[PDB]
Amino acid sequence: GEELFTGVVPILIELDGDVNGHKFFVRGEGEGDATIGKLSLKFIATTGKLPVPWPTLVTTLVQAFSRYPDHMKRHDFFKSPEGYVQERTIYFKDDGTYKTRAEVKFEGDTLVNRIELKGIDFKEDGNILGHKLEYNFNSHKVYITADKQNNGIKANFTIRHNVEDGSVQLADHYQQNTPIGCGDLPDDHYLSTQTILSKDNEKRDHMVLLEYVTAAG
């Protein structure tokens, strides 16, 4: 479990999503080091120019790569081969919602997250469909609690998206994680995340991401 995350690990991410009838597919590749808790990834939209801004998708697209301090090592559920299912419901205040299901598992020596995403009730001329969101990401605290009944995790947090007019767009995240494999459960704690979005060079619509994540509480 924990033992697979020592050293650099290759990541593959595939996202299959439809928002308001607009289907699109995204793929990402890169490396992550759990010891430093760093993620470096490149994302490409195979299907064309995205109907939705890149910052909206970020959370959906590797928590396991969060760095748990040695005292906190007992509470790292994510690391805890078979992998897990990550399901999220995302509410954009004054706008539509995301419902997503994902499986994070190990295929060969590569770590893979494949995702299915559905988008509903999103307004035209809204921040999201408008692409009025700034190409950046802020820093957040992800609150984690244990859910014994589903022998799994639950998480709650709200994301802040900067808007070009200087407004702030809030996305409410409701998250639960359950394990594919048989046979770990953590006291309440949180993840502290910082993210940077950059560009390549590439013609295709794309995203480049750097993520530092560490646990506390």
Added chain:
Amino acid sequence: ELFTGVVPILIELDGDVNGHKFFVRGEGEGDATIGKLSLKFIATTGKLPVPWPTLVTTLVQAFSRYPDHMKRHDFFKSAMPYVQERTIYFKDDGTYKTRAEVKFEGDTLVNRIELKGIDFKEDGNILGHKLEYNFNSHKVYITADKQNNGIKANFTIRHNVEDGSVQLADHYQQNTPIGCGPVDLPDDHYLSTQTILSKDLNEKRDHMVLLEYVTAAG
């Protein structure tokens, strides 16, 4: 324990070899008590790009007959209602990689397979269809690995070639149980297999009929 008596089988195959993809479906009956399988396979896409004998191994070891003495080592039935993944090396030719889930849906037994084929050179026995439409008899060696709570198997298959050459396929197999139940591990033992491939006068479509006999020993 589900086996006693005849059990229905359904098999569906989604496979691609060297960019040539195809889908195969099969139906029939098997009873573990006799260790007998009766099945008919149909090629829904159209004509096969690969010989039928190549597919046979990848096409439910649960139906093997374990003697009263051997019942303690039958992993397949215990896991009912497992995952079977295999790597197949054809000598002086390409390779097969497959993933499978063998499970019970209703009272019917189902095997669903995913197969990808690579590196098979053109003008070769497999692409060429130089394989005789027949199957020989083989021994499948099974070992347990507690680390994945499962069994592993190794054997090599012999495929007849029309000129009298023999084509060898090396099988590396791993089985793991979907259910949390055990599914308890077996001591080293083997399965003895005999197979007959037949055809149906009446079927328009490309098809295979096989009358599989399998029993275990130590």
